[PDB]
Symmetry: C2
Subunit: 236 residues, 2 copies
């Protein structure tokens, strides 16, 4: 069947800082479809943000050129490894729906778990290639799923996994994801609600930058092929 | 005053084609804030889309690197002029919220009117540099406005302006914009309703790719700096 892609993001910064070192960039693939690049750079605040932007940018450039996701992740690593002399790490994920291969690809270098929903049944997946920027020969670990209606992917930054840690009551990630992801729940509502649960776990003072990325594939129930995108930034 | 920023896009393609030649890409600005890059490649279909992705990708790269918006537009022009040997053109606009300068910039090489909302009313503005790609000495025109509550910018592709040509009754752009953009209307609803007005004017058969980009700055009504992004698109 034809598929509709919903992607959504909800994110905030560590309490006490004025910006996040987590970057999510969205890029249109020249073969059709889209990618989200999630980078969580070492550190917080201004410097962390500058570097996460450039790391994301290294991957986004290559994706724009139709370079394959794995190669793009390796390039982002090579960039960070060269520019910071093997001293700074970052978590990197690339989450793609490739409308030419009819596939969802997840290229992971993060050491944070993800959730996968298969028609409402969620599981936690710990497979990743670990962080980029430090080991010379770092490689992504890769997941590929047929792009069918009912597939959901939830990717987070470590600030979500860390929520509650301050008071020794860590967020139960898999349990909270399955809870919030109802059958008709839109991607944005999953992302919003997972982030809110993490914020409640940190008593409203994020202990680290927090980012939730949700992909939901569903059946087509809009007849005109309209593409939409929206960004909201409160408190600019 | 502090502002909450909404950016929304609604877009579809020319009837009888399978893809749009118009591209919108979003990029986070290193100095703080973001840019939307709108490109309408010459013609329609896959050729036009290749061209517009090529230009948009260049402009995103430059803005990610911190190249100032007017310089970025000229460099995107230099890139197209080189890659296609001076033979092909594109309409380009860059719409930026610069959170370091507290301003909204519109860098124009499109030759398509825009709408500007302020003082509780709308105006149509045609100031622009030429299309990019062909003329060696192309330069952007840059409009800047303070980033304050109550500011709206609506950018469109020429398929919106030309809607209603077939039936003899062109879409009334300013009247429609003012009608659909009431004080409390969200950016996505404005984008959607203007797109639909254009589709209706073309009797449900889009005469040329149609893209609506809406930026709305509003008073802060929220308390947590939680950024949200959403993309909804066919795979298909
Ligand atoms: Mg970080
Ligand atoms: Mg982190
Ligand atoms: Mg065109
Ligand atoms: Mg056009």
């Amino acid at each position: 069947m034809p598929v509709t892609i919903e992607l959504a993001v909800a994110k905030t910064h560590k309490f006490g800082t004025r910006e996040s070192g987590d970057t999510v960039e969205l890029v249109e693939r020249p073969g059709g479809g889209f990618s989200a690049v999630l980078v969580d750079g070492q550190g917080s605040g201004a410097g962390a943000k500058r570097l996460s932007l450039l790391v994301a940018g290294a991957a986004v450039r290559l994706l724009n050129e139709g370079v394959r996701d794995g190669a793009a992740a390796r390039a982002a690593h090579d960039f960070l490894y060269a520019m910071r002399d093997g001293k700074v790490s970052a978590a990197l994920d690339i989450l793609s729906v490739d409308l030419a291969s009819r596939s969802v690809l997840v290229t992971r270098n993060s050491e944070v778990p993800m959730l996968l929903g298969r028609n409402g049944e969620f599981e936690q997946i710990s497979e990743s290639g670990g962080r980029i920027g430090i080991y010379r020969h770092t490689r992504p670990r890769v997941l590929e799923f047929p792009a069918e209606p009912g597939l959901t992917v939830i990717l987070v930054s470590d600030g979500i996994i860390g929520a509650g840690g301050r008071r020794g009551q860590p967020l139960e990630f898999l349990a909270t994801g399955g809870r919030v992801a109802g059958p008709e729940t839109p991607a944005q509502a999953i992302a919003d609600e997972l982030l809110e649960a993490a914020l409640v776990a940190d008593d409203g003072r994020a202990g680290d930058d927090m980012t939730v990325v949700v992909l939901r594939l569903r059946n087509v129930e809009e007849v005109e092929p309209i593409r939409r995108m929206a960004l909201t930034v409160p408190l600019g």
